[PDB]
Structure formats: structure tokens, C-alpha cells
């Protein structure tokens, strides 16, 4: 019985987004913190800035907040890219 609190977001960025401007990574990380804080308390926020799929993980204090973040974010648009949001499988390291 896993009560998963971690949300995996993909297609949020591409690593080439960061190569010209060294401030963009923190800009978009903080943008994600702001949006995700609408769903509940965040425990841990990670952007995998070398991953070609544009992966971030957002870990919430309670599984209900993760469920609500997944419902609201999957299919939304971020900087002109349509993102996916889904429960972490509990094993994959991005």
C-alpha cells in the first residue's frame, strides 16, 4: 500500500534551454515551486536539468496534495510546452 507523495513532471523544459542563459534553470525551478505550492506543502523539488525529457520531481507532504497536483497539471502548458504529470513509480532515478 503506497501512498505516493512524489509527482513526476515531464516535457517541462529541454536541457538546451539552459545553455545560453545560466539564470533560466533557477527561474523555472522557482516558477514550478510557486505553481505547485497551490496544491499543498512541498517537501522536495528537483529539476533534472540534463535529462532530455525535461523531468522534474515534486514531493508533497501528503498524498492528497500529490493527487491534486497530478489532476491539475497533467496536460497543462508551461512556456509553450505541454507537460505530463504522473505518480512516481517509486524506483526510477532521473
Amino acid at each position: 500500500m503506497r501512498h505516493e507523495r512524489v509527482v513526476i513532471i515531464k516535457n517541462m523544459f529541454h536541457p538546451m534551454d539552459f545553455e545560453d542563459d545560466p539564470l533560466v534553470l533557477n527561474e523555472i525551478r522557482e516558477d514550478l515551486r510557486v505553481e505547485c505550492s497551490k496544491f499543498g506543502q512541498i517537501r522536495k523539488l528537483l529539476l533534472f536539468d540534463r535529462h532530455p525529457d525535461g523531468v522534474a520531481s515534486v514531493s508533497f507532504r501528503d498524498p492528497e496534495e500529490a493527487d491534486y497536483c497530478i489532476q491539475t497539471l497533467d496536460g497543462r502548458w508551461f512556456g509553450g510546452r505541454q507537460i505530463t504529470a504522473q505518480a512516481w513509480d517509486g524506483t526510477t532515478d532521473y
Binding site: 516558477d31 505553481e35 502548458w77 508551461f78
Partner: peptide, 4 residues
Amino acid sequence: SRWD
């Protein structure tokens, strides 16, 4: 912000 880049949202939506």
C-alpha cells in the same frame, strides 16, 4: 511566468 510561463504558466498556461
